[PDB]
Amino acid sequence: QCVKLNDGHFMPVLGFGTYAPPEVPRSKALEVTKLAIEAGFRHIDSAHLYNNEEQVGLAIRSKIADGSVKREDIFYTSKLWSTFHRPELVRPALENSLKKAQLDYVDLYLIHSPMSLKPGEELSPTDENGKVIFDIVDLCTTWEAMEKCKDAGLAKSIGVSNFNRRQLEMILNKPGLKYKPVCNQVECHPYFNRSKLLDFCKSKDIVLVAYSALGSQRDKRWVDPNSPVLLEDPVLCALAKKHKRTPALIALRYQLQRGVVVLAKSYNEQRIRQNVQVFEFQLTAEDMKAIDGLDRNLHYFNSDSFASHPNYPYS
Amino acid sequence: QCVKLNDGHFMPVLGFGTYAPPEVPRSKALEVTKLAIEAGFRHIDSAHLYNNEEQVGLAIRSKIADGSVKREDIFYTSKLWSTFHRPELVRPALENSLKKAQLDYVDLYLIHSPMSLKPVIFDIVDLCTTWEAMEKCKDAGLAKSIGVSNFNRRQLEMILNKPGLKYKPVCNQVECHPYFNRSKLLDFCKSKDIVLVAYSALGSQRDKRWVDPNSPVLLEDPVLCALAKKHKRTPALIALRYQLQRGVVVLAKSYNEQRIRQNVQVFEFQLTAEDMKAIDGLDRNLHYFNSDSFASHPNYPYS
Numbered sequence: 001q002c003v004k005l006n007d008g009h010f011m012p013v014l015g016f017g018t019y020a021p022p023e024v025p026r027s028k029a030l031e032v033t034k035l036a037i038e039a040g041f042r043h044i045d046s047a048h049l050y051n052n053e054e055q056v057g058l059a060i061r062s063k064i065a066d067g068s069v070k071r072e073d074i075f076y077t078s079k080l081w082s083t084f085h086r087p088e089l090v091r092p093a094l095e096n097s098l099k100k101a102q103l104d105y106v107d108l109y110l111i112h113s114p115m116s117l118k119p120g121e122e123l124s125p126t127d128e129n130g131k132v133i134f135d136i137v138d139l140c141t142t143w144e145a146m147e148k149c150k151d152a153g154l155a156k157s158i159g160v161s162n163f164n165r166r167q168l169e170m171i172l173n174k175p176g177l178k179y180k181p182v183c184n185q186v187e188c189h190p191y192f193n194r195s196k197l198l199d200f201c202k203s204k205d206i207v208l209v210a211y212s213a214l215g216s217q218r219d220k221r222w223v224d225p226n227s228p229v230l231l232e233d234p235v236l237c238a239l240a241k242k243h244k245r246t247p248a249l250i251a252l253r254y255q256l257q258r259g260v261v262v263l264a265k266s267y268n269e270q271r272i273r274q275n276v277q278v279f280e281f282q283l284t285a286e287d288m289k290a291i292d293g294l295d296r297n298l299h300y301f302n303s304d305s306f307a308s309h310p311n312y313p314y315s
Numbered sequence: 316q317c318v319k320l321n322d323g324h325f326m327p328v329l330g331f332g333t334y335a336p337p338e339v340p341r342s343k344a345l346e347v348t349k350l351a352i353e354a355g356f357r358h359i360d361s362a363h364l365y366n367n368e369e370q371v372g373l374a375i376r377s378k379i380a381d382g383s384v385k386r387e388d389i390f391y392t393s394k395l396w397s398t399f400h401r402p403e404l405v406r407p408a409l410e411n412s413l414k415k416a417q418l419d420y421v422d423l424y425l426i427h428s429p430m431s432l433k434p435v436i437f438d439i440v441d442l443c444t445t446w447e448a449m450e451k452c453k454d455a456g457l458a459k460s461i462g463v464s465n466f467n468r469r470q471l472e473m474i475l476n477k478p479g480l481k482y483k484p485v486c487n488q489v490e491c492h493p494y495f496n497r498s499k500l501l502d503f504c505k506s507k508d509i510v511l512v513a514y515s516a517l518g519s520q521r522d523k524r525w526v527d528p529n530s531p532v533l534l535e536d537p538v539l540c541a542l543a544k545k546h547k548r549t550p551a552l553i554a555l556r557y558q559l560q561r562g563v564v565v566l567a568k569s570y571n572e573q574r575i576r577q578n579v580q581v582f583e584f585q586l587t588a589e590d591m592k593a594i595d596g597l598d599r600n601l602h603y604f605n606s607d608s609f610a611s612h613p614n615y616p617y618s
């Protein structure tokens with residue numbers, strides 16, 4: 001249940017989302033990541049931003065050491081945070097991630113966002129008025145430094161996240177390009193199905209990896225609370241009844257059948273184990289059209305401040 | 316049951332109107348707002364002018380503290396009064412409102428009226444500068460969304476065409492009901508992705524200060540009454556429903572517990588296309604608010 005990436009590596013099509021808000025004790029990431037592996041997840045998505053790489057790594061090490069899985073059976077993703085886009089900062093950020101996870105390589109290193117931020121200690125640097133401070137970086141040079149991380153064997157594959165088509169073409173058309181992005185990890189779900197971007201990515205052999213596939217964690221910092229709750233969608237609910245599954249399983253399955261690699265976060269043991277059931281059934285072509293029909297150009301993540309970033313992807 | 320605004324925020328389509336005349340003690344605002352939340356209202360409309368923001372806010376805070384609702388479940392609107400249009404006065408007026416209601420932010424801040432008043436003495440203010448100060452309030456996170464009220468099309472175009480515009484108004488809150496359905500203004504607002512929010516949707520409170528005393532009583536309309544029978548509802552419900560099926564966000568003021576609880580039933584039924592046309596037929600260009608003291612104001616929206 002993998003897809004062949006454009007660099008020859010393989011990516012499991014269902015991935016485990018590890019981000020949880022800061023009110024959740026950090027110890028939980030260790031427990032839940034073990035649960036996810038035990039359930040059948042082999043693809044695991046983390047980032048420097050998440051502040052959980054040590055716990056996630058410990059989980060992966062645990063299930064390797066106890067013999068459940070081998071390191072080569074696990075696909076582990078980390079991400080370069082936006083304060084580290086300047087090319088001289090790229091390799092040391094990856095090396096810092098690896099040391100935290102206590103892993104030797106990542107299967108995938110992503111540029112987390114095209115929205116560069118001022119270099120420094122703070123993840124979210126701000127000024128006197130409390131506004132986030134942007135930075136300006138040529139992302140082609142960031143990409144070159146990523147290419148070097150791959151040649152150095154620190155990342156098996158490299159790709160991007162939150163890029164639009166124009167931003168992807170920039171990399172694709174870069175003079176002297178060594179490696180295409182293997183993927184673009186973007187918000188993708190039946191309310192924002194990204195069909196155009198997906199067709200583009202497919203035409204270039206770039207895998208679209210969907211986050212907030214279950215409608216996001218609806219974090220107050222980024223998501224309007226009165227936006228529609230994806231999993232309450234009547235069409236999703238009716239297909240769940242029809243198939244004897246759940247709305248989450250429908251939303252996940254949808255992605256798999258359109259060629260999308262899908263992430264699912266859960267910190268609940270029973271939902272974790274439910275989500276791996278995604279491979280047990282299939283949606284019909286008409287089921288898929290009905291889900292396609294839910295598209296409404298709704299991205300759950302919003303930021304007044306980041307909408308003004310020159311590299312904002314929804315501009 | 317929300318509509319997506321042009322800044323990405325969501326607004327519940329049925330809102331609770333809080334204004335009551337000064338003869339009504341403010342303690343009632345506190346009680347009736349609690350009743351409204353208890354009934355299912357989540358969108359609550361107040362203003363500086365209403366002299367009730369403390370009571371309305373205390374109601375909201377109370378239902379949050381007792382665990383009925385969360386702050387994020389509540390969509391709270393306030394308004395910038397006309398004596399505060401000068402741009403340096405905008406943010407402190409919002410800040411004063413926030414402190415009265417004891418809220419961190421308002422979900423919506425409106426310019427109440429285009430008829431500026433001296434900080435009745437008129438004032439002359441470039442409302443584009445007022446709007447810029449509103450944008451800065453939104454960027455400061457004091458207001459999730461910003462919009463206007465009682466603007467006509469020309470006044471809306473002035474904001475829309477402002478050089479350097481950062482945020483369109485999300486809405487224009489205007490008098491709107493089957494005797495004055497505003498179809499032309501609504502089509503304009505729709506064409507610009509601006510939500511029309513209807514006040515006096517039930518035919519106004521018929522305040523002796525502002526209403527023609529022999530103006531027809533909306534809720535007594537024979538067509539409204541016939542549709543209420545047909546659907547086994549009430550004329551108020553028909554009026555509210557009418558607005559919801561034409562894309563309009565509707566307010567409804569009631570300080571009576573039973574009527575408050577009645578009004579939330581608006582989501583239980585639907586009018587047919589022909590029912591809608593019959594209600595469209597009722598338009599008689601009737602304004603329940605008469606202000607011809609205000610007719611000479613350069614910004615009077617009905618000039």
Ligand SMILES: NC(=O)c1ccc[n+]([C@@H]2O[C@H](COP(=O)([O-])OP(=O)(O)OC[C@H]3O[C@@H](n4cnc5c(N)ncnc54)[C@H](OP(=O)(O)O)[C@@H]3O)[C@@H](O)[C@H]2O)c1
Pocket residue numbers: 016017018019020045046112161162185186210211212213214215216217231246248249263264265266267268271272274275
């Ligand atoms: N590149 C980026 O910028 C970016 C942005 C956002 C997310 N991500 C990644 O993508 C991952 C997933 O996206 P997301 O965090 O937005 O969450 P998500 O996968 O859309 O949604 C998971 C939400 O749905 C719930 N859930 C999971 N399984 C369910 C089921 N079977 N039935 C009902 N509810 C269920 C979970 O709550 P419980 O935990 O209570 O089960 C969870 O909070 C993140 O953790 C992160 O790894 C990346």
Ligand SMILES: NC(=O)c1ccc[n+]([C@@H]2O[C@H](COP(=O)([O-])OP(=O)(O)OC[C@H]3O[C@@H](n4cnc5c(N)ncnc54)[C@H](OP(=O)(O)O)[C@@H]3O)[C@@H](O)[C@H]2O)c1
Pocket residue numbers: 331332333334335360361427464465488489513514515516517518519520534549551552566567568569570571574575577578
């Ligand atoms: N932006 C502006 O310039 C502006 C202007 C006017 C109003 N507004 C806002 O819009 C709100 C509503 O407008 P409005 O004040 O003109 O009042 P309205 O919503 O038209 O209601 C008028 C009267 O209808 C009665 N009513 C309510 N529900 C009923 C039902 N189910 N059956 C029978 N009667 C019912 C109420 O009496 P009881 O109280 O006895 O039920 C109320 O006094 C105001 O409170 C204010 O928030 C804004």
Ligand SMILES: O=C(/C=C/c1ccc(O)c(O)c1)OCCc1ccccc1
Pocket residue numbers: 019047049113115222301302303306307
């Ligand atoms: O860049 C970001 C991304 C946030 C984030 C949150 C949770 C995650 O699991 C994750 O991978 C990333 O944060 C700022 C939020 C934002 C929202 C909308 C548009 C622009 C920026």
Ligand SMILES: O=C(/C=C/c1ccc(O)c(O)c1)OCCc1ccccc1
Pocket residue numbers: 334362364
């Ligand atoms: O412009 C007005 C009334 C506007 C009005 C009424 C009800 C509303 O729901 C609303 O939004 C607007 O008349 C003068 C107001 C006044 C006079 C003396 C003392 C205090 C207040």
